[PDB]
Amino acid sequence: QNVGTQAAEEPLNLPISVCTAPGNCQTEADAVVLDSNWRWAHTTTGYTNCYTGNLWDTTLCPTPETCTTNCAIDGVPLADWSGTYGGSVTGNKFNLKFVTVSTNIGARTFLLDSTKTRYRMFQLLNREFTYDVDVSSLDCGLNGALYFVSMDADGGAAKYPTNKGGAKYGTGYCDAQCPHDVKWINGLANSKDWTPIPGDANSGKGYYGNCCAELDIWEANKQSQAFTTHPCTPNDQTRCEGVVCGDNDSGDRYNGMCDKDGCDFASYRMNDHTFYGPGSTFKLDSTKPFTVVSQFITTDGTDNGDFKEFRRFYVQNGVRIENSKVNFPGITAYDSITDEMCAATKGLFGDLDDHKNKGGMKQMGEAMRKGMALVMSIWDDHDVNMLWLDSNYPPTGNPSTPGVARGPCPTTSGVPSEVEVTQANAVVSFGNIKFGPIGSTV
């Protein structure tokens, strides 16, 4: 995309901590940038929309190349962050409102480095990543997500010279779902064969998808939470078409370059229904804030080893809370993501181990070694109504069959039109982000 001249781009300042030992950290003066999908797209030498509602203008965008020549994405000024997009920062806390009323629904954002010209790339192997979260106002159907993806640090600017904005304009998004709803891919409008998504007034799908590796630290609302590894072959940003995208709609979910299911550790799905929930007698009380700690263990305990284990623990009101465990007869009580856990649990659930097909923890680790961009988002799910996270999936499945039940939400929950009314004022908060060696962040 070209860059428009109507509004300066002003990312929100967000300090994080880089740590060397427990309680010995230094501030890193980073910032938050809005994903290019949420930006106004208009004519390069005017005010005329190139995209309105869920459609590209066919006169301006008869082809992707012409669209890209004629159109530009514009900046987010400071005033518009809260007023239009529902984003705000107080000290080291970042807040994202779900619905902001001209009416904005959801948000996806990235962490910029201290220069505000590149994404802050995190080399996560043999490191610990930690943050405080509040998901108390997110119920069934919503997801306040924090995760990493194998985006380029410059959003693709060096690879795709028609991308003028780079990381500064939140470009280059890709993930392990190979999404077609990304409006700008490889520096070009994804306007070919663009199709609105029914019941989604703001979104559509273009000819291409954009694939890359994804490490989900946090997919969650107050009812259920998960962390998940998604390797791809290769891991780096890859525009896809046809079978390579692994499109759900053509029966290709397991035929593409990315592991779409991922290998998940989701406490409720692993059959501990009392670990996490909205109340003081759950082990971890989702009505109150808490700290989420993630440790990425290698084979030799060094930065050069292969990724072998994703460990997790929590801190809430000064109380250390170890992760829940897998709880099925004849299955080891795993409390972390490893290749063995993935094989054993997917075996039990009858899920295809595409994680293993894509190179497993080792391949996931190669993405983490090269460095990944931090994503913070809030969203509802127009495909599957978040049932995969917090309900029975498939909805018609027996909840006593291992793998089906992922949370207590009813199978009628999560319809975007309903959650966008009922949960309009939901806000996820991510704060006090800390990054360092294992054992350094609490």
UniProtKB/TrEMBL annotation:
<dbReference type="GO" id="GO:0009251">
    <property type="term" value="P:glucan catabolic process"/>
</dbReference>
<feature type="disulfide bond">
    <location>
        <begin position="19"/>
        <end position="25"/>
    </location>
</feature>
<protein>
    <recommendedName>
        <fullName>cellulose 1,4-beta-cellobiosidase (non-reducing end)</fullName>
        <ecNumber>3.2.1.91</ecNumber>
    </recommendedName>
</protein>
<keyword id="KW-0624">Polysaccharide degradation</keyword>
<keyword id="KW-0136">Cellulose degradation</keyword>
<dbReference type="GO" id="GO:0016162">
    <property type="term" value="F:cellulose 1,4-beta-cellobiosidase activity"/>
</dbReference>
<feature type="disulfide bond">
    <location>
        <begin position="140"/>
        <end position="409"/>
    </location>
</feature>
<feature type="disulfide bond">
    <location>
        <begin position="61"/>
        <end position="67"/>
    </location>
</feature>
<dbReference type="InterPro" id="IPR013320">
    <property type="entry name" value="ConA-like_dom_sf"/>
</dbReference>
<feature type="disulfide bond">
    <location>
        <begin position="232"/>
        <end position="258"/>
    </location>
</feature>
<feature type="disulfide bond">
    <location>
        <begin position="240"/>
        <end position="245"/>
    </location>
</feature>
<keyword id="KW-0119">Carbohydrate metabolism</keyword>
<comment type="similarity">
    <text>Belongs to the glycosyl hydrolase 7 (cellulase C) family.</text>
</comment>
<feature type="disulfide bond">
    <location>
        <begin position="174"/>
        <end position="212"/>
    </location>
</feature>
<keyword id="KW-0378">Hydrolase</keyword>
<dbReference type="InterPro" id="IPR037019">
    <property type="entry name" value="Glyco_hydro_7_sf"/>
</dbReference>
<keyword id="KW-0873">Pyrrolidone carboxylic acid</keyword>
<feature type="disulfide bond">
    <location>
        <begin position="263"/>
        <end position="342"/>
    </location>
</feature>
<feature type="modified residue" description="Pyrrolidone carboxylic acid">
    <location>
        <position position="1"/>
    </location>
</feature>
<dbReference type="InterPro" id="IPR001722">
    <property type="entry name" value="Glyco_hydro_7"/>
</dbReference>
<keyword id="KW-0326">Glycosidase</keyword>
<keyword id="KW-0732">Signal</keyword>
<feature type="disulfide bond">
    <location>
        <begin position="50"/>
        <end position="71"/>
    </location>
</feature>
<feature type="disulfide bond">
    <location>
        <begin position="178"/>
        <end position="211"/>
    </location>
</feature>
<dbReference type="GO" id="GO:0030245">
    <property type="term" value="P:cellulose catabolic process"/>
</dbReference>
<dbReference type="Pfam" id="PF00840">
    <property type="entry name" value="Glyco_hydro_7"/>
</dbReference>
